């Protein structure tokens, strides 16, 4: 349908337009793990407790 | 010596079998430091890594974990460098660790430093934490597991998707924005450490999943090679896909037209697309916060 037509065109064309060309860093693109220097900025803590069910 | 050694291996883990711990633990290790007193280390290495295989083989925590403790000073005693051989031998042991034991932390802890002391990753060996992450989510570490698995190997990347899957699932009530809760640090994460493969990799295999439980109304956008998994009812995953395809033009325009469009998405993950529009985007002013 066209209850999400709004973002749909968007995501859509952002994605053309973003791929014109070969991006800088293609997909297959992995800095060597011997230079990571940091690791960004910490993640948010999740309210779900984990466990391991059989 | 090759064939000493061979030999007491076995009066040693008799005396396992037999109910003498404290016998086969004083003996190996007064033996033990015998060879590191003459700096053959070589020797002392195999003998005390295969008495804490048996200690922890026999369901002798108390030995075994300080046994492991003992090789890891010899390790850096004899600056044993990291490599197959020396990552091995950790891996062989932190196999028969129990996911319960008192120590497995600081075990863990110890052979990553040790790691890292040794070799040019300043987070430790990837292979090793592959190993390492499964150890610590056997004990419900799961916060600690993510760290190692995202630093890890590519079996680590799936036990990564698993780990946030499996978690996914443990929730009662999932929304809209729960699924991005999860979603969103396989692409944040990886993209920090710049792994655009696996970045790809795990959201592929997590965007499956997804759509063959929860079957939500979606459709595949295909342009110039990628491809957008438009959720109808998750905008969050959108906005997450278009962010991860941006950082790799590493084109400015981009990152603002699509920050300007998604105000929300914005402010809530404030910091992280900060430090993107950093790594990303040579940006060196702060993120204006939109709320």
Known sequence: TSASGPEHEFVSKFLTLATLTEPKLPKSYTKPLKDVTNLGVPLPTLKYKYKQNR | ?291
């Open chain 2, 1 to 291: 010596m090759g064939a000493k050694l061979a030999k007491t291996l076995q009066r040693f883990e008799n005396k396992i079998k037999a109910g003498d711990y404290y016998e086969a633990h004083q003996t190996l290790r007064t033996i033990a430091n015998r060879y590191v007193r003459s700096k053959s280390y070589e020797h002392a290495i195999e003998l005390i890594s295969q008495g804490a295989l048996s200690f922890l083989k026999a369901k002798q925590g108390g030995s075994g974990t300080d046994l492991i403790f003992y090789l890891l000073e010899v390790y850096d005693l004899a600056e044993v460098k990291v490599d197959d051989i020396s990552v091995a031998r950790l891996v062989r042991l932190i196999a028969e660790l129990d996911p319960s034991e008192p120590n497995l932390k600081d075990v863990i802890t110890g052979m990553n430093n040790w790691s890292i002391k040794f070799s040019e990753y300043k987070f430790g060996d990837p292979y090793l934490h592959n190993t390492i992450g499964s150890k610590l989510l056997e004990g419900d570490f799961v916060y600690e597991a993510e760290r190692y698995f995202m630093l890890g190997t590519h079996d680590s990347m799936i036990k990564y998707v698993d780990l946030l899957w499996d978690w996914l699932c443990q929730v009662d009530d999932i929304e809209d924005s729960t699924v991005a809760e999860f979603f969103s640090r396989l692409v944040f994460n990886y993209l920090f450490i710049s792994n655009i493969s696996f970045a790809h990799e795990s959201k592929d295999i997590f965007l499956e999943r997804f759509i063959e439980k929860f079957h939500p109304k979606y459709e595949k956008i295909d342009k110039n090679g990628y491809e957008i998994v438009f959720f109808e009812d998750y905008s969050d995953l959108n906005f997450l896909q278009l962010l991860l395809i941006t950082c790799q033009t590493a084109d400015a325009s981009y990152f603002l037209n699509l920050k300007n469009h998604y105000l929300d998405f914005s402010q809530a993950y404030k910091s992280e697309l900060e430090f993107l529009g950093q790594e990303y985007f040579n940006i060196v002013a702060p993120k204006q916060t939109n709320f």
